[PDB]
């Protein structure tokens, strides 16, 4: 019973940002040292918890949200940020107690023809609630006229593709993002480390 981050980080394929993939880590021990002592991550921003120290403290649940965005938008995966990704795809709450882990993945998620299979939402009547996962393809009514699933004048499909090319600039290259959220309820904890 060793926490399988193995089948999250090293996972062969990743999810599209708006359709982000949550893994409920429970009843296992994790040497988190495995992750941070590895040099090969662009962005290991931790918010409201020392990861060096939680290898001797027991949390009820570790949630691991995995998905792909272009490197430019990595910064937007942080509490209080706003924009396309922040407000329409994957929101984080202000009292976030986890880490954002992102590595460049041009090598994996970019075709010569352009890997259009990774997507992102563009419009929405309102902003996402924290940790909301919206996958509806409602034909988005911008202007006055109500759309009856008919596209066109003031009516648009709410998702778009990324088009990752190996020749794209480092910013428009695809980064793979894991987000380790930690919760501590009043139920007996089940995700500790060694020390």
């Amino acid at each position, epitope marked *: 019973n060793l926490c399988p981050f193995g089948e999250v980080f090293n996972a062969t394929r990743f999810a599209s940002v708006y359709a982000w993939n949550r893994k409920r880590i429970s009843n296992c021990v994790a040497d988190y040292s495995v992750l941070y002592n590895s040099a090969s991550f662009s962005t290991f921003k931790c918010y409201g918890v020392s990861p060096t120290k939680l290898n001797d403290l027991c949390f009820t649940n570790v949630y691991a949200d995995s998905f792909v965005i272009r490197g430019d938008e990595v910064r937007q995966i942080a509490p209080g940020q706003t924009g396309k990704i922040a407000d329409y795809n994957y929101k984080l709450p202000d009292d976030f107690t986890g880490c954002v882990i992102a590595w460049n993945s041009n090598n994996l998620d970019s075709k010569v023809g352009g890997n259009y299979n990774y997507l992102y939402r563009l419009f929405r009547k309102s902003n996402l609630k924290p940790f909301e996962r919206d996958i509806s393809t409602e034909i988005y009514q911008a202007g006055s006229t109500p759309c009856n699933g008919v596209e066109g004048f003031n009516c648009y*499909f709410p998702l778009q*593709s990324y088009g990752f090319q190996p020749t794209n600039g480092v910013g428009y290259q695809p980064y793979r993002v894991v987000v380790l959220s930690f919760e501590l309820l009043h139920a007996p904890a089940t995700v500790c480390g060694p020390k």
Partner: nanobody
Amino acid sequence: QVQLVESGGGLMQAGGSLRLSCAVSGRTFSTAAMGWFRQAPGKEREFVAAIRWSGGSAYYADSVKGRFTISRDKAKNTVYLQMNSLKYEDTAVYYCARTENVRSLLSDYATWPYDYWGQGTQVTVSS
């Protein structure tokens, strides 16, 4: 490999109608949109119509708006071009095209390029 196969091309006295059928076999899941293109004799091959896989909202091109009907059957992985009121200018080779590129703006499916193309099929309008 992904392969497109047109059929339903042939002969039709102008004012009749003809149906075209483009069958797709491959990674169906990744299909964004299907498009029809035609190349007339002497002319560069121009946009006809495109349809979004996930909603069936079509973008009829300017010279066919009010005559043709593009439609798709997701279970059959087929896209259809219904060609009502055939004109003499409709005499061409009709090519169906597939793109995996999901584009929010529908109108883009004229401007933008297609990754996979069918061998095409002849429609000849007669008397």
